[PDB]
Nucleic acid binder design. Structure first.
Ligand SMILES: O=C1c2ccc(O)c(O)c2C(=O)N1Cc1cccc(Cl)c1F
Ligand SMILES: O=C1c2ccc(O)c(O)c2C(=O)N1Cc1cccc(Cl)c1F
Ligand SMILES: [Mg+2]
Ligand SMILES: [Mg+2]
Ligand SMILES: [Mg+2]
Ligand SMILES: [Mg+2]
Ligand SMILES: [Zn+2]
Ligand SMILES: [Zn+2]
Lengths: 184, 368, 368, 184
DNA sequence: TGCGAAATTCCATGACA
DNA sequence: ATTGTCATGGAATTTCGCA
DNA sequence: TGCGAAATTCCATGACA
DNA sequence: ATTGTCATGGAATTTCGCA
């Protein structure tokens, strides 16, 4: 059996609803299975339509052999299937209630949820503008298991923005205090 | 003047008037019987006025001015005086064309890595599609990989929106652009400093300097045209298609598509190359590092048989940018301060500013 | 198709499939182990579809299309099929650029006599001077002698007014013009038939064909610009001055001014040549007849290393005149009916008309 | 003494008033002394101004060494002198009441007067349009004394409009009849 | 170690408001 | 303070298949 | 029958909405 | 049924003045 490559499998998921930012409520999350490279797209809903609009941007840069997802409505719709068939993309579903990805991906998805939370406090409304900087962060993060960042595995070079401070990612006592108060 | 010619009439030899000719007087004027005929020899104090009246008839150059003068006059070294006048005629110097070509073009080294250098530019106005009139084109120098964004104007603001989306993927060391309004604004400068991106500008009115992206503009319009044949020019929806189509097109000289130069492996697009199916990603990546360094690089072509190359301190003239009807195509002479490279100079310009300028927008001032 | 490949799998030799390679079956498909790797050999009945999908990705030419196909397939003589498709892609044929230059330019003989042939043309719009915006320029082919008339429009009517005044001096055998609205009107045709003047037209969109007058336009604008430096562009009053100035300017290669070629003696202008002061007018006139026949005539330059020349019955395409944004720059293929000379042809055009057209507005249709 | 050349001497004169044609009343007549080439300019008056305007057209084609004229007002004005001096043209006057030209010129001037008259009958009002055809006629007329037409002497070639019918120039009995009636 | 044909490489031409 | 580029399709040159 | 300098001729470059 | 042209100013080549 042949080694794993970038574009072999994209893992997609919705995060939200979030506080509205510039009119947007959700984040479509796409993570490349081999590299752990993350792309994020803000949407107004977890609909097939918003998914399609967003994946059309990504798939005009690179097209995955397989998309993997949970059995979300947006992903199991027959429009979404027609879309994928058109692009020769095989669709792949985890069984309901039993979400499986891969350790690398799970850990990645975890980092995303945590890093989001850390920045939507203080400014729960300004996250739209920060999605770029979040991705750079996530993609220039060192991977314990591989010797490399997703940036490096995707492009085979160092990056002009290394994130040399493998960071806190944890909430300071101030943020626990005004997040345990704002969410009440 | 009259001392010299007096001294001459009495048959004594003056340097410059060959001895074998007979120099008489007649009608109050010094004459000489030259093989072409009898010509008047004016006094030296008259010569500049004569050369000037002859030149002024139609602001003629060397020979055509000389031929008028020779009709009536002769004196030693006529062309030296004609040329002295041509070098002082403001009107001729700023209106005439050059007749010396530029030195041969440079072929700057390809960027070493993806994201080392972006070339960006606008195409448009296009026929309105969904309220959009322009396209921002972003071309990675090393790979050729290209991003397209439809805008409503070629503004700083639409540039910033688009590049915020693009730079989600990666931040480039350098962004090269021409001097369009959208790129030279202080807002855009800030936007780039904020990110440690260096802004690099083409010399003015010299799109060849953005050659990398301009050339991609051609491919973009050419594919857009073919796809639109016999349909109304609804291009907005095709940008994505064109982007992907071009990023995955082979360059016959390189034998690689821009996508391959960027990722070292094809994605799920038609006719994906499968030659590295058995390598590990890491084996693949070091084959890509090898492929990247060994790409064909062109060389500086032969100079044309009559080119010029700028020398420090030379008088040169910058081409007027958008010259009005019936107005000179050249600026007043100015001086080469620094030779940045053999196709690029700094000059002390037509006001009193320093300008970095392409040799293609210059002529060497004639007659020195 | 399947007959051929069946016949092949059992190890018997088919013309075009070299014997030294092993042709197996796998995943339901015929394959072969070529040095580049394992490639699928599709049945012949599949090939056109494949070549077409590959070409269609970005409407690529020969090599760039081939490189896609080679990623997955092999078969005998792939490029022949690729080229067959390129020659049938309407979209590519009318959008792509040519990469063959025109054959070298003709240098038509100089008219033998003054008034044998006039070249006429308009310059403008200019900045309004006294309500005038254009200049009619009339250039005698043989002599270069030029007449200027300020008009309010480049109309048939203003042409006729001006030429009635000019032709008071003499009637020309031929008047050559480009295809401007003012010259092609039925009124102007009548005006010329009325006088036994033959009208001769440039091929369309090819100002080089009016080279004689176009070149004089340059001198006219150039002298006008110099005279107007640092003044407002009040040109109307300078036409007379410019006319006379140019008619009396030497051509360095000829050693004669147009006035001299026309009259054989200078008038009372500055620096008049006086060499024939002692000849009778008749002696003068036969010296002029001699001078007229012995003028320098240039020759057809070397062809460029990749020019083409039209052959009767060839497929060729006429350049679209004013092509809309994002629309093809070429018309559909058409056929060379007659080769008028090596730079001029008659073609059976894009509708069904005959058109006389310059080779510069044509490309040879690619792939035949 | 040196042989006679074209441009050595232009002989100028006014003819008129004539019936108004397209607003014009007079004809300035210029005849080259050596060749007998004729130029004609319609004017609104025999003024220095109209002369200058008209000669500016001609002198932008060729400039005579000398202009000869009678002592007409237009020609003896100091403006006309200033004009000529500016162009290095010597002015030359016949003594009052004793008009002398040269035989060639006199004969030419005669032809002009007669040919005009012959065409201003029947259409005394349409002469403006005919001035071109009159000049061609006059300039392609064979000269008894020289073997040549003015066209030929001026340009040293044959003309594309030869006037092979050395013509009547005399009034038919019809024209004497409706000219001896219209001028009454 | 040499032939005829296919395949590959060369490279002038032209277009990027 | 910056700098031309590269798809294209005939032609020229090299390589392939076979002996 | 020969030299140094002036004069002439050559000719690539570029512009004619 | 029509077709490039020619001023320009350095450089290349020729001719001139003298011996
Ligand atoms: O003339 C411009 C121009 C002017 C100003 C711009 O901002 C700009 O983008 C362009 C532009 O693309 N071109 C087209 C072009 C003409 C000739 C040669 C080349 Cl390489 C070329 F690209
Ligand atoms: O493009 C035009 C044109 C179009 C239509 C006309 O009616 C006309 O007179 C002209 C015209 O003079 N030019 C200028 C020009 C451009 C390129 C080469 C040459 Cl020789 C040249 F003259
Ligand atoms: Mg631009
Ligand atoms: Mg551009
Ligand atoms: Mg025209
Ligand atoms: Mg023109
Ligand atoms: Zn001047
Ligand atoms: Zn095509």
């Amino acid at each position: 059996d042949r080694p794993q490559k970038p574009f072999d499998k994209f893992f997609i998921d919705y995060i939200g609803p979030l506080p509205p930012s510039q009119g947007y409520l959700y984040v479509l999350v796409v993570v490349d299975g081999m590299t752990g490279f993350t792309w994020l797209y803000p949407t107004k809903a977890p609909s097939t339509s918003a998914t399609v609009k967003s994946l059309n941007v990504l798939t005009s840069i690179a097209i995955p052999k397989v998309i993997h997802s949970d059995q979300g409505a947006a992903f199991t719709s027959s429009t979404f299937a027609e879309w994928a068939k058109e692009r020769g993309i095989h669709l792949e579903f985890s069984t309901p209630y039993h979400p499986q990805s891969s350790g690398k991906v799970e850990r990645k998805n975890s980092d995303i949820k945590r890093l989001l939370t850390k920045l939507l406090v203080g400014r729960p409304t300004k996250w739209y503008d920060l999605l770029p900087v979040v991705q750079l962060a996530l993609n220039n993060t060192y991977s314990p298991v591989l010797k490399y960042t997703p940036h490096q595995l995707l492009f085979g070079i160092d990056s002009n923005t290394p994130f040399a401070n493998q960071d806190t990612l944890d909430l300071t006592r101030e943020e626990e205090l005004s997040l345990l108060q704002e969410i009440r | 003047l009259d001392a010299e010619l007096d001294q001459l009439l009495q048959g004594h030899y003056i340097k410059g008037y060959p001895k074998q000719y007979t120099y008489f007087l007649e009608d109050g004027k010094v004459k000489v019987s030259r093989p072409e005929g009898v010509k008047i020899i004016p006094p030296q104090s008259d010569r500049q006025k004569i050369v000037l009246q002859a030149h002024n008839l139609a602001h003629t150059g060397r020979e055509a001015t000389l031929l008028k003068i020779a009709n009536l006059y002769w004196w030693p070294n006529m062309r030296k005086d004609v040329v002295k006048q041509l070098g002082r005629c403001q009107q001729c110097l700023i209106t005439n064309a050059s007749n010396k070509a530029s030195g041969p073009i440079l072929r700057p080294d390809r960027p070493q890595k993806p994201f080392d250098k972006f070339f960006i530019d606008y195409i448009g106005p296009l026929p309105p599609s969904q309220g959009y009139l322009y396209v921002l084109v972003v071309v990675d120098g090393m790979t050729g990989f290209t991003w397209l964004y439809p805008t409503k104007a070629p503004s700083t603001s639409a540039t910033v929106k688009s590049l915020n989306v693009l730079t989600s993927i990666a931040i480039p060391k350098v962004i090269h652009s021409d001097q369009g309004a959208a790129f030279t604004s202080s807002t855009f400068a800030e936007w780039a400093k904020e990110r440690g991106i260096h802004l690099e500008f083409s010399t003015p009115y010299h799109p060849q300097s953005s050659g990398k992206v301009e050339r991609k503009n051609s491919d973009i319009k050419r594919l857009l045209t073919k796809l639109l044949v016999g349909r109304p020019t609804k291009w907005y929806d095709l940008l994505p298609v064109v982007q992907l189509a071009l990023n995955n097109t082979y360059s016959p000289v390189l034998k690689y598509t821009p996508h391959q130069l960027l990722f070292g492996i094809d994605s799920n697009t038609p006719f994906a190359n499968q030659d590295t199916l058995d390598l590990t990603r890491e084996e693949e990546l070091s084959l890509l590092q090898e492929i990247r360094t060994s790409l064909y690089h062109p060389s500086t072509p032969p100079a044309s048989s009559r080119s010029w190359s700028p020398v420090v301190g030379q008088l040169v003239q910058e081409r007027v940018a958008r010259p009005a009807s019936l107005r000179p195509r050249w600026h007043k002479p100015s001086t080469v301060l620094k030779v940045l490279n053999p196709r690029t100079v700094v000059i002390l310009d037509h006001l009193g500013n320093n300008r970095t300028v392409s040799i293609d927008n210059l002529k060497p001032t004639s007659h020195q």
